[PDB]
Every structure is written in structure tokens, then in C-alpha cells.
Design an enzyme around this catalytic site. Structure first.
Site, PDB file in Angstrom:
ATOM      1  NE  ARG A 164      -3.269  -7.639  -4.264  1.00 34.83           N
ATOM      2  CZ  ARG A 164      -3.624  -7.575  -2.987  1.00 34.83           C
ATOM      3  NH1 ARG A 164      -2.731  -7.270  -2.055  1.00 34.83           N
ATOM      4  NH2 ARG A 164      -4.881  -7.810  -2.642  1.00 34.83           N
TER       5      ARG A 164
ATOM      6  CE  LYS B 143     -13.441  -5.961   1.705  1.00 34.78           C
ATOM      7  NZ  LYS B 143     -12.214  -5.458   1.027  1.00 34.78           N
TER       8      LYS B 143
ATOM      9  CB  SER C 163      -4.362  -6.766   4.343  1.00 32.98           C
ATOM     10  OG  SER C 163      -3.921  -5.461   4.004  1.00 32.98           O
TER      11      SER C 163
ATOM     12  CG  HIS D 159      -1.849  -1.112   1.313  1.00 31.01           C
ATOM     13  ND1 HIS D 159      -1.924  -1.959   2.398  1.00 31.01           N
ATOM     14  CD2 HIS D 159      -2.797  -1.535   0.442  1.00 31.01           C
ATOM     15  CE1 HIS D 159      -2.876  -2.853   2.193  1.00 31.01           C
ATOM     16  NE2 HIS D 159      -3.418  -2.614   1.014  1.00 31.01           N
TER      17      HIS D 159
HETATM   18  N1  LIG Z   1       0.653  -5.454  -2.298  1.00 36.72           N
HETATM   19  C1  LIG Z   1      -0.094  -4.649  -3.056  1.00 36.72           C
HETATM   20  N2  LIG Z   1       0.439  -4.119  -4.199  1.00 36.72           N
HETATM   21  C2  LIG Z   1      -0.298  -3.300  -4.984  1.00 36.72           C
HETATM   22  N3  LIG Z   1      -1.570  -2.918  -4.762  1.00 36.72           N
HETATM   23  C3  LIG Z   1      -2.081  -3.464  -3.614  1.00 36.72           C
HETATM   24  C4  LIG Z   1      -1.431  -4.312  -2.727  1.00 36.72           C
HETATM   25  N4  LIG Z   1      -2.266  -4.658  -1.670  1.00 36.72           N
HETATM   26  C5  LIG Z   1      -3.348  -4.017  -1.967  1.00 36.72           C
HETATM   27  N5  LIG Z   1      -3.345  -3.267  -3.109  1.00 36.72           N
HETATM   28  C6  LIG Z   1      -4.407  -2.432  -3.711  1.00 36.72           C
HETATM   29  O1  LIG Z   1      -4.850  -1.380  -2.817  1.00 36.72           O
HETATM   30  C7  LIG Z   1      -6.301  -1.311  -2.836  1.00 36.72           C
HETATM   31  C8  LIG Z   1      -6.921  -1.697  -1.478  1.00 36.72           C
HETATM   32  O2  LIG Z   1      -6.620  -3.057  -1.088  1.00 36.72           O
HETATM   33  P1  LIG Z   1      -6.930  -3.628   0.399  1.00 36.72           P
HETATM   34  O3  LIG Z   1      -7.070  -2.457   1.296  1.00 36.72           O
HETATM   35  O4  LIG Z   1      -8.080  -4.553   0.291  1.00 36.72           O
HETATM   36  O5  LIG Z   1      -5.730  -4.387   0.877  1.00 36.72           O
HETATM   37  P2  LIG Z   1      -5.627  -5.792   0.373  1.00 36.72           P
HETATM   38  O6  LIG Z   1      -4.228  -6.239   0.510  1.00 36.72           O
HETATM   39  O7  LIG Z   1      -6.075  -5.892  -1.175  1.00 36.72           O
HETATM   40  O8  LIG Z   1      -6.544  -6.739   1.301  1.00 36.72           O
HETATM   41  P3  LIG Z   1      -6.910  -8.304   1.231  1.00 36.72           P
HETATM   42  O9  LIG Z   1      -5.674  -9.232   1.668  1.00 36.72           O
HETATM   43  O10 LIG Z   1      -8.119  -8.438   2.267  1.00 36.72           O
HETATM   44  O11 LIG Z   1      -7.378  -8.651  -0.126  1.00 36.72           O
HETATM   45  C9  LIG Z   1      -6.759  -2.238  -3.948  1.00 36.72           C
HETATM   46  O12 LIG Z   1      -6.931  -1.514  -5.178  1.00 36.72           O
HETATM   47  C10 LIG Z   1      -5.641  -3.242  -4.055  1.00 36.72           C
HETATM   48  O13 LIG Z   1      -5.556  -3.817  -5.356  1.00 36.72           O
HETATM   49 MN   LIG Z   2      -8.400  -6.519  -1.351  1.00 38.35          MN
END
Ligand SMILES: Nc1ncnc2c1ncn2[C@@H]1O[C@H](COP(=O)(O)OP(=O)(O)OP(=O)(O)O)[C@@H](O)[C@H]1O
Ligand SMILES: [Mn+2]
Ligand SMILES: Nc1ncnc2c1ncn2[C@@H]1O[C@H](COP(=O)(O)OP(=O)(O)OP(=O)(O)O)[C@@H](O)[C@H]1O
Ligand SMILES: Nc1ncnc2c1ncn2[C@@H]1O[C@H](COP(=O)(O)OP(=O)(O)OP(=O)(O)O)[C@@H](O)[C@H]1O
Ligand SMILES: Nc1ncnc2c1ncn2[C@@H]1O[C@H](COP(=O)(O)OP(=O)(O)OP(=O)(O)O)[C@@H](O)[C@H]1O
Ligand SMILES: Nc1ncnc2c1ncn2[C@@H]1O[C@H](COP(=O)(O)OP(=O)(O)OP(=O)(O)O)[C@@H](O)[C@H]1O
Ligand SMILES: Nc1ncnc2c1ncn2[C@@H]1O[C@H](COP(=O)(O)OP(=O)(O)OP(=O)(O)O)[C@@H](O)[C@H]1O
Ligand SMILES: [Mn+2]
Ligand SMILES: [Mn+2]
Ligand SMILES: [Mn+2]
Ligand SMILES: [Mn+2]
Ligand SMILES: [Mn+2]
EC number: 2.7.7.3
Lengths: 159, 159, 159, 159, 159, 159
Positions: free
Chosen positions: F91, F42, F129, F18
Site C-alpha cells: 500500500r 505485538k 489495522s 486484507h
Molecule cells: N489496507 C491494506 N492494503 C493492502 N495490503 C494491506 C493492507 N493492510 C495490510 N496489508 C498487507 O497484508 C499483510 C499483513 O498486514 P497486517 O496483518 O499487519 O495488517 P496491517 O494492517 O499491516 O497491521 P498494522 O496496522 O499493525 O500495521 C502485509 O503484507 C500488509 O502489507
Molecule cells: Mn503491518
């Protein structure tokens, strides 16, 4: 058990991604045949002779690796070489549907040959020989993706 | 209702996968036109004449199947043939994004033509004409994927 | 021929996307059974009775559509409805993968029940019941994606 | 060389697909540890003890297979089992994506534990524990997808 | 901040999809360079001269758009043009794995160039220049996917 | 021009992935709003207040970043924040599909809010996450994937 594995491809040219995959293979299998296909398939930047020599140099530090060239059906060669393991590298940017097709066809052709998919380092998970060649042919820096010997040879090829 | 469906492709050559799909189509639609495209598109191993004859033989046992050749736009032919159903086979190794593109383009061209996607047996879900041709051309056994008549013709072609 | 087709789903709630698909189905087959599964494991927003009512009104304008609820094995219900065509919608790509599984399982359970995948308009290619509910939970305007009666029900259910 | 491989999963319950994969593994490596994770977050149908018992009997015919349960970090359990090969099955495409994540995480946790993906027979390429359970919840015949002892257990558990 | 973005491609010919993407880009970035590659890559239906002129006309109404042609490595040109944003259109029918590969290669080549993926209207999310050219070349109506000036030019080209 | 961009998500908890994405965003736009959605459906590990605090500290070094929580419709919150750019990270591939849905829905709700997808470093291309939490639930070392303050919080929360 003493498994003999085959890692086929055109290696035109061999990259750090290939080195990554074959190195991982040598850690789990006794003998790994790095098989280079004499695939005129769309003008091999390098010739089989060059292809082989470059590979031999890039894997010279690997004791149980044998670089050999072959023509026509990979399965027929694997059978003659008495290989029971077929190494396939799986990149993040891989054509999975294609790998499935290939593996099932190879299983039909030689069921005693088991397809094993290995994963390269994140570092080499988004590249390929064609992309590397294309970038280099169009004046881009690809030093980072190739063994030193291949890098030198590539520059000579494009000069 | 008496639906007229069209099942287009190059059939170069027709495989057991194609037979599977067209057979499934004849069970739900009254008349199925197996349309063979005169697609010089990258040297048709077989010619339209051969292509058609092989298909006619492989589907002779199917009463409501009509094998016909056509050139240029598939939609234009489908329209002239008064087809309202377009049969598309969906393999596990299919280029889905491509099928979507094709279907939407065909819908723009002829909205009265509805794209119907059928699924072949698990047995033929991982093969294709090009892979079969490539394997056969490189000395591999593809007997299992083709109707007997096609198998015989293929051997003659590669001899 | 007069084929009987079944279009199964949770329809919680039925959307314009579903309407699009069932409509395309009525133009190909004589009778279409829109079958709503109880799907307790999904903890539906609307009860089976509610979803049935909603769908009935949403498809009243379609003469050859029949809405029925069921908690049985879809395959068994299909056989008991005398259906030989199983309608499924293909919008996004990860759906296709899941769809092949259910299709192959259903073919195993009832081999004469032929799977037919249809493609929705570009207009509804990116919506789903869950997404519409998610937007509605946050008071977003979803009037454009639902039949008039369903939207009212969704509004009343969320306030 | 005598490699020790681990095949981790929830196996709730173990299916013919799992049997297919572990069997292919025993033909490549000396010892294979079929590791069943507690996976409380998944709310498994069968208890860890039940799944272990089920798998033990389902793989009794395989001399070099060892079934063990664990609630630890898979990587740590692998290290403690002295395994250097991590077996994973690749059937469908969205699995591959998720598999790369776990593989890269596991490589981060234990770099010498090499990931190896195997491909199941076409026969089991479309089944999963969840799908089998879903069919079984509706009394559908799933005898073809499970080892004899597992089917009985599944039947008895659902009635 | 005053960002300079580059939107590269062959534009052979430019479509409504391209117009959609570049228009969206001009709304978030100060200056957008619509870069046309002199890519003999498989016979550009139109020449760079034609390619450029058509683009200039189709984007004449866009104030901060600059149409320029370039040869060889896109990254080298972007660097010389002082661009820090690289616009990539993402269709529903896009080769995502390829876009990832390209973006990572471009990041290696020029880390100061950030890849930005924009999404076109549902209307243009299932088409491409090659499909449009192929359909038109085979007597299909593609008027709907092109700017008027391009449409007129295309007809002249195929006559 | 001075654009205001919003980067919405659950951030439960915020990871280096993030951080990577938001950082790339601050280099393209004047002001970036990292918006944390309540996402009760969630069942987040951390409360909205906790996630906000965590993110604030994790992005303190970024001058033009603003962390805010919200339970409203993302589109409405975006409009109320005066944002015209919606940041999303790409990703893995199944993310792209889901992302197109939300993007098209959000464009329907607020047409001037332009979707912009960014690509993370190869380093964080395989984390999420949920995966980090899963590893942490089993006491695995996740220090490499989280900001210092988040790791501590995650450790303290799980023991
Ligand atoms: N490691 C990462 N690299 C690039 N973009 C990411 C990454 N993790 C999350 N995102 C992006 O940031 C935004 C918010 O994602 P979020 O807050 O759900 O975290 P998450 O890692 O995707 O959670 P989860 O493990 O529950 O799927 C989304 O558009 C997601 O694609
Ligand atoms: Mn997600
Ligand atoms: N960077 C890489 N990382 C992991 N596996 C790779 C990589 N490059 C190639 N492979 C794998 O090695 C095998 C042979 O690939 P090949 O010899 O065609 O090189 P290539 O890079 O894939 O060529 P091309 O760019 O023309 O596609 C394949 O199984 C392929 O997936
Ligand atoms: N084995 C198969 N099973 C199911 N459908 C198939 C099979 N082979 C082809 N089809 C479908 O039939 C139609 C025509 O395909 P085509 O005539 O190109 O043969 P092909 O096998 O796909 O050729 P190629 O190997 O060159 O790709 C397409 O819709 C395709 O998806
Ligand atoms: N918008 C749509 N366009 C085309 N087909 C659709 C659409 N929505 C659903 N379908 C198809 O209709 C069938 C039943 O879907 P379902 O009843 O689960 O609604 P759903 O929208 O897919 O629900 P959910 O949001 O929970 O995934 C499936 O085959 C599904 O692919
Ligand atoms: N039918 C199958 N063929 C090949 N590999 C499989 C099959 N089923 C599971 N696997 C693989 O075995 C490992 C463990 O899978 P798991 O124990 O979750 O069973 P599962 O069938 O995948 O469960 P679920 O239905 O809950 O997804 C994974 O790597 C998975 O990809
Ligand atoms: N209809 C479209 N909608 C959105 N983006 C598009 C569209 N067509 C092309 N693009 C994007 O614009 C860029 C350049 O594409 P290009 O110039 O190759 O045209 P093209 O339509 O993709 O050609 P082709 O049909 O040969 O693949 C790419 O990033 C591509 O994804
Ligand atoms: Mn390759
Ligand atoms: Mn084809
Ligand atoms: Mn669904
Ligand atoms: Mn699983
Ligand atoms: Mn393109």
C-alpha cells in the site's frame, strides 16, 4: 484576512486532479491565481493559448479563480501578483524530495510566499499530466481523468 | 594511514554544497582529488576548462585538494589515480535508490574503491547544480549558493 | 593522518552486517572504536556486558578495532574517545532519514565529529538485529547472518 | 475570509519546530487552535495539563493562537472547534506517508476539514520531540531546539 | 487454473535480472509472455529484431516462455493476448511511486489484468539496463550482469 | 497448474484492505491460505482464536480461501502447508522496504516459496489495522473499512 494564493504549473493539459486541488484552494483562500507557465519544456502538447482556454473553461464554475499565463521564474510572477500563498498538490506518487527542494528554493527567492501542500482525492492521487498524455498518445482511454472540454480537445490534438 | 580519496562529479558549476563536502573530506583524508567529468551530458553550461578553473579557485584555500578533469568511467580514473575512497555527498533531497545503485556498480567495477557518503550543512542540503542553473537561467537570485568567483562567471554566462 | 573513528550502536546482537561495516571502517582509519550503547529504552535482549563480550570475540581478528560500552551521550563519549569520525551503516532507505536526524543532532553537539555513512554488501543489505531475533524466536536458522560465537549465544539465550 | 485552523499533535514537549509551523499558520489564517491530544497510548513524558501550560507560554507572543487539550477523536474536536483547516508539518519523508493516511482518514470523518501541510525552516527540519528527549535523557544540550520555558521544564523533569 | 501472464519491457538488452524475474514467473504461471516493446524511446541500443532474438536465446531453456514484440499500449496487447497477470520486477532500487502509478493506470485501462510484483535475487536487485548500457558505453565491465549471448552482442554493438 | 498460496499476517483485526488482497489472490491461485500469526510481541487486541473466527466469517464467501492460525516460523508453516507462493500487500512505501527484508529472509529460509506482492484498490491504500483501531478507540466511525462482523466485534471489544 484576504489571502491571495497562486497555483502554478504547466497544465498541459489540466486534469481532474488539478481541478480537485484548485477547488480545495478556493475554499480556504479568497483569491486563487491558477498560473500557467509558458514552458516550452519538452514540447507542450498544448500551447499556452490552448492551455489557458481549457483551464478557464474547466474552472469557470469557480468564482474566485483567475487563470493567467506567465513566463520565466514563478516566484517573480507570484511577487508581482502579490501572492503570499503558493499552492502545491501532493499526490501519493509525488516526488517529495523534489517538492522539498522546490519549496526551499522558492522560500529563498521569496520568503513572503508560503508553500502550502494540499492533498487530492484518492481518486486522483496516482496520476499526472505526462502519464495521461503518454497513455492517450499510445491509444489508451483517459476520459476518466479529464474535464469534458479537455477530453474533446485531446482527441482533436491526437487525431 | 595515507588515504587518497576521489570526489567525482560534473561541477557545472561547483556550488557551496560541493565546497562543503570537499572541505569535510580534506579533514579526514590525506589527499582529495576533486575529479571533474568532461560530461557533455546535456550541454555543460560551463566547459571542462571553465569547470576546472572555477573549482581550482574555489578550493585554492584547501591545501590537500587536487582538481583534475577526466573522461569516461569514473572507476577507471579512480583506479589509475590510486584512490581507495570515493566521496559522495548525501543531500536531504538525494536520490538514495540511485546512490545505492551507483555505489554497488562502482564496487563491482572496483572493489578496492570504498564509497563514503558525507552529509553537507543543513544550509546546502536542499539544492543542486541543475536547480541552481535553472533558477538563474530563469532570472532568479542564486548568489547565496555559489562561491564569489562562480557567481561572477555565471552572470557572464547568462548575459 | 591517524584518524580515530567510532562506530556506535546497540548491537543487540552484533550481526554479520555490523562486521561488514566495521571491517570497511578499519581499512580507512587507523583505529576504530565499536561503541555499544546501553540503550535501556530499547529493552535489549543481551546485557551491555554480554553484547560487549560478544562483539569483542566477533571482532578479535581485526587488529585495530576496540570494543567499548557506554551509557553517556554518544557525542560526549565520542569526544572523550578522541574520535573525529562517526561511522554509520546505510542499508535500507528509511534508515537514511533517521540517520540524517541523528547526524545533524550529533554535528550540533560536536561539530568536529564528521559523519561517515558506509554501505554494506548486498549480502547483508536486508538484515537487522531485530529481524534475526524475530526469526530466532521462532527457531529459524540464522547461522548465516551471525558470527559463530553470537549464534551460539543467541541459541542458548532462546532456550 | 476568516478561517479557523487546527494544529493537532502530542507536543510532548512542544519544540521550536512546532513553533515554526504554528507561526506560519497564524500568517495565513485568522485563528489557529494548537490542539494537544492526550495520547495515552504514547505514554507522554509530560501530562496533558503540563503540555498545555508549556505550549501556552511558548506561544503567548502569538495573538491569534489558542492552546487547547483534547482526548476526543481529532476530527470531532475539529468540528466542535469550528475549524475547517487542519495544519500538519512536513519535515522528513516517512512522515509524509503516515500523514497521508491520517489525512485521508480525517477527510473520511470530516470531509470539509481541509488538510494543509506546511514545511519548517531548514533549521528545524531534522528535530522531533522524541529526539530532543533522547538527547536530554543523556544530558545533552538541547537549549537551541526548545522555547526557554520548555527547556527549563525538560531539565527539571529529567533531574 | 491455467493463467496466462505477460512480462513487458524494452529489454534493451535483457539482463540476468530479467532472466531472474521471468524464471520466477514461469514457476507459478502456466504461460508467460515476455513482451518486448518496440520503444524508440530514447534510441534502443538494440533494435526490436535484435532485442527479440537475444531474449529468445536467453530464455530458450524455459519451456513456457514466449517472446513476442508489441507496439503502443501494453494493456491493449495484454488484452489481445488474453493475459490476466502482469509481471513487474521490483528491485531494491525501484521507483516505487512510479510502479504504483503505472499499476493503477493499468488497472483503470484493463481491470482484468492483475499486477504482480516479483522480487529478484539480491544479486540483481541494484542494477538496470540503462545503468548497464551507460557503464559499458563508458568502458566498464558488465559481463557479470548479462547472459553470454547478450554480452557478445553488446561488445559487437559498442565496437 | 494448481498452486497453493499463503497470505500471512497478524490481521488484528482483518480489514477491507486484507479482503481486497486475498480476493485478488484467489483469482490467480487455486487455493489460498490466509494465515494468522499469533504475534505475541505485538500484543494483539484480539486473541488468535478471535482473529481466526473473524477472518473465517469475513472470507466465507470466498470458496478457495482457508483461514488458519499459527505460532511457528512463517516459512516452516508455509512449507508444511505445501504453499509455494507467499502473498503480501503493498500500500504505502515504507511497507515495501520492510517487505523486502522479510521476503529475502523468507527466501533464505525457504527458497521455493516465491514472494508475490499485490496492490490494493485506491480505496484501501491508506488504511491499516492499527489506524482503524486508533480511530475506533476514539469512537470514530470505521464501518466503511471493515467487514460487517469485524466492525461489530471491534465495537463490542471497545465498549
Ligand atoms: N489496507 C491494506 N492494503 C493492502 N495490503 C494491506 C493492507 N493492510 C495490510 N496489508 C498487507 O497484508 C499483510 C499483513 O498486514 P497486517 O496483518 O499487519 O495488517 P496491517 O494492517 O499491516 O497491521 P498494522 O496496522 O499493525 O500495521 C502485509 O503484507 C500488509 O502489507
Ligand atoms: Mn503491518
Ligand atoms: N492528479 C494530481 N493530484 C494532485 N496534485 C496534482 C495532480 N497532478 C498534478 N498535481 C500537482 O499540481 C502541480 C503542477 O503539476 P503539473 O502541472 O506538472 O501537472 P503534472 O500532472 O504534475 O505533470 P506531469 O505528468 O508532466 O508530471 C504540482 O504541484 C503537482 O504535484
Ligand atoms: N548541495 C549539495 N550538498 C551535498 N552534496 C551535494 C550537493 N550538490 C551536489 N552534491 C553531491 O556531489 C556529487 C556530485 O553532484 P553534481 O556534480 O551532479 O552536482 P549536482 O548538484 O548533484 O548536479 P544536479 O543539480 O545536475 O543534480 C554527488 O554525490 C552529489 O550528491
Ligand atoms: N545489516 C546492516 N548493514 C549495514 N549497516 C547496518 C546493518 N545493521 C545495522 N547497521 C548500522 O549499524 C548502526 C547500528 O545499528 P544497530 O546496532 O541498531 O543494529 P540494528 O541492526 O540497526 O538493530 P535493529 O534491528 O534493532 O534496528 C546503524 O548505523 C545501522 O544503520
Ligand atoms: N520539527 C518539526 N518541523 C515541522 N513539523 C514538525 C516538527 N515536529 C513535529 N512536526 C509536525 O507537527 C505535528 C505533530 O507532531 P508531534 O506532536 O508528534 O511532535 P513530534 O515531534 O512529531 O513527536 P515525535 O518525536 O514523538 O515523533 C505533525 O504533523 C508533525 O509532522
Ligand atoms: N535487475 C532487475 N531486477 C529485477 N527486476 C528488474 C531488473 N531490471 C529490470 N527489472 C524490471 O523489469 C521490468 C522492465 O524493466 P526494463 O525493461 O526497463 O529494464 P530496466 O533495467 O528497468 O531498464 P532501465 O535501466 O532503462 O531503467 C520492470 O518492471 C523492472 O522493474
Ligand atoms: Mn509535474
Ligand atoms: Mn547530480
Ligand atoms: Mn537500528
Ligand atoms: Mn510525531
Ligand atoms: Mn526501467
Amino acid at each position: 484576512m484576504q489571502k491571495r494564493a497562486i497555483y502554478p504549473g504547466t497544465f498541459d493539459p489540466i486534469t481532474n486532479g488539478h481541478i480537485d486541488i484548485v477547488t480545495r484552494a478556493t475554499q480556504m483562500f479568497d483569491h486563487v491565481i491558477l498560473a500557467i507557465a509558458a514552458s516550452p519544456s519538452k514540447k507542450p502538447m498544448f500551447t499556452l493559448e490552448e492551455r489557458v482556454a481549457l483551464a478557464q473553461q474547466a474552472t469557470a464554475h469557480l468564482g474566485n479563480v483567475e487563470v493567467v499565463g506567465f513566463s520565466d521564474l514563478m516566484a517573480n510572477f507570484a511577487r508581482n501578483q502579490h501572492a503570499t500563498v503558493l499552492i502545491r498538490g501532493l499526490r501519493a506518487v509525488a516526488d517529495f524530495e523534489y517538492e522539498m527542494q522546490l519549496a526551499h528554493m522558492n522560500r529563498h527567492l521569496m520568503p513572503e510566499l508560503e508553500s502550502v501542500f494540499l492533498m487530492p482525492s484518492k481518486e486522483w492521487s496516482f496520476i499526472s499530466s505526462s502519464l495521461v498524455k503518454e497513455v492517450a498518445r499510445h491509444q489508451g482511454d483517459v476520459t476518466h481523468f479529464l474535464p469534458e472540454n479537455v477530453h474533446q480537445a485531446l482527441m482533436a490534438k491526437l487525431a
